[PDB]
Amino acid sequence: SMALKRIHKELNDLARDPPAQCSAGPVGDDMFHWQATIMGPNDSPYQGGVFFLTIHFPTDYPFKPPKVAFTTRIYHPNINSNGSICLDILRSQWSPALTISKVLLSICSLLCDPNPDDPLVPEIARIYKTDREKYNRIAREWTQKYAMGVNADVQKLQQQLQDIKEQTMCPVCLDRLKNMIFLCGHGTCQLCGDRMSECPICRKAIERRILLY
Amino acid sequence: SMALKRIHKELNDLARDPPAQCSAGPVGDDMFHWQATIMGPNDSPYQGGVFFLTIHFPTDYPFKPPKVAFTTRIYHPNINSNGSICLDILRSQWSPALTISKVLLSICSLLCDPNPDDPLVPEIARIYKTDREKYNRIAREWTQKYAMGADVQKLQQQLQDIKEQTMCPVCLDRLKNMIFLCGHGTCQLCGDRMSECPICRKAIERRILLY
Ligand SMILES: [Zn+2]
Ligand SMILES: [Zn+2]
Ligand SMILES: [Zn+2]
Ligand SMILES: [Zn+2]
Ligand SMILES: [Zn+2]
């Protein structure tokens, strides 16, 4: 299915282009259920901690966002005691062009820059807004408590094929070439583009779909 | 210049996969003046002959067609005694996405299938339509008179024909970052210099830039 192909694609890109700190992959034979790992961002009060997350891909991913939750306790205004995450990318601001990699980076950014005006734990948002120093101390204490313990020419042809693909491939499936363009200047393949009403890159509504030949 | 880059690119591509029926290249150091040779196709009464042509590239090639003419006399309804060729590919159906190789192949095709539609030599066209056997005899006689003087990893080079689908068809150098409503596209530099699509020829209604 489109969802399963896209999940395999993201897995291969994560393996050939690993993130330095984060990590994510299938737990067993179920490609639609992943485990992820995030290291506490170095300039944050979570530095030194390792946080696990569960990911669940819907059957019609990536047109629908994945379900992401923490399983490691963490002291944060936008993450509750069940590990739910309040992150726009995961609900309203989901785009079919985003990947698990980007989602993990956005979670690390959320850990660095909380949104206390949309809390999941009001008392933590209140501390963050009133006493940043105390918020940092407590977030560190919680981190310590729960989150610790003949070839040159082939390599030139491949680099050329790869940098042409990066600029011309559909951003939703990463599989076919963009043969359908919207008036906003962005495009997809026909297959992914017929399943959307707004552009996956700038989110403007699709006024018109012009097919390429 | 754009014309000179495109001429060198076409010359290199004529080197990596030369056309079997034709041959063409600079006469000396003049890149804008070539000599060409086409062999009389076995499909026509010109079979056995070798015909010479001159090629003239305008300074703003390929947005204007090259001027191609025979220097070898030939008996044909669409080629007159000055060596001029009546072939829409050279004027009305010219596209800047076309190359000298396509043109020479179209000229060999014209030698195979003359057009008595609006010919350049009415009397020869009349003979062609009236006494094809006599047309063939005279064409053969004129031919006789004037015209007889690794791969295991190269899958990638094959895969790289993806360039054909993504590169500008005018310059063959940049990528297609501008789209017309007909569905075809060019780079912005080539596209802004055209009023018709280089692939399907519909008038360019609108140019949409890609990102
Ligand atoms: Zn697609
Ligand atoms: Zn857009
Ligand atoms: Zn000249
Ligand atoms: Zn171009
Ligand atoms: Zn067109």
Swiss-Prot record, chain A:
Changing residue 91 to A: Abolishes histone H3 ubiquitination and decreases interaction with PHF7. The active site is at 86 (glycyl thioester intermediate). Residues 2-148 form the UBC core domain. Changing residue 123 to K: Abolishes histone H3 ubiquitination. One of its GO terms (molecular function) is ubiquitin protein ligase activity. Keywords: ATP-binding, Nucleotide-binding, Transferase, Ubl conjugation pathway. It catalyses: S-ubiquitinyl-[E1 ubiquitin-activating enzyme]-L-cysteine + [E2 ubiquitin-conjugating enzyme]-L-cysteine = [E1 ubiquitin-activating enzyme]-L-cysteine + S-ubiquitinyl-[E2 ubiquitin-conjugating enzyme]-L-cysteine; S-ubiquitinyl-[E1 ubiquitin-activating enzyme]-L-cysteine + [acceptor protein]-L-lysine = [E1 ubiquitin-activating enzyme]-L-cysteine + N(6)-monoubiquitinyl-[acceptor protein]-L-lysine. One of its GO terms (cellular component) is extracellular exosome. Its EC number is 2.3.2.23, 2.3.2.24. It comes from the Eukaryota. GO terms for biological process: protein autoubiquitination; protein K48-linked ubiquitination; protein modification process; protein polyubiquitination; protein ubiquitination; ubiquitin-dependent protein catabolic process. Pathway: Protein modification; protein ubiquitination. Coiled coil: none annotated. Interacts with SCF (SKP1-CUL1-F-box protein) E3 ubiquitin ligase complex. Interacts with CNOT4 (via RING domain). Interacts with E3 ubiquitin-protein ligases CBLC, PJA1 and PJA2. Interacts with PDZRN3. Interacts with PPP1R11. Interacts with E3 ubiquitin-protein ligase PHF7; the interaction inhibits cleavage of PHF7 and promotes association of the complex with the nucleosome core particle. Accepts ubiquitin from the E1 complex and catalyzes its covalent attachment to other proteins. Catalyzes 'Lys-48'-linked polyubiquitination. Mediates the selective degradation of short-lived and abnormal proteins. Functions in the E6/E6-AP-induced ubiquitination of p53/TP53. Mediates ubiquitination of PEX5 and SQSTM1 and autoubiquitination of STUB1 and TRAF6. Belongs to the ubiquitin-conjugating enzyme family. This is Ubiquitin-conjugating enzyme E2 D2. The lineage of its organism: Eukaryota, Metazoa, Chordata, Craniata, Vertebrata. The gene is UBE2D2.
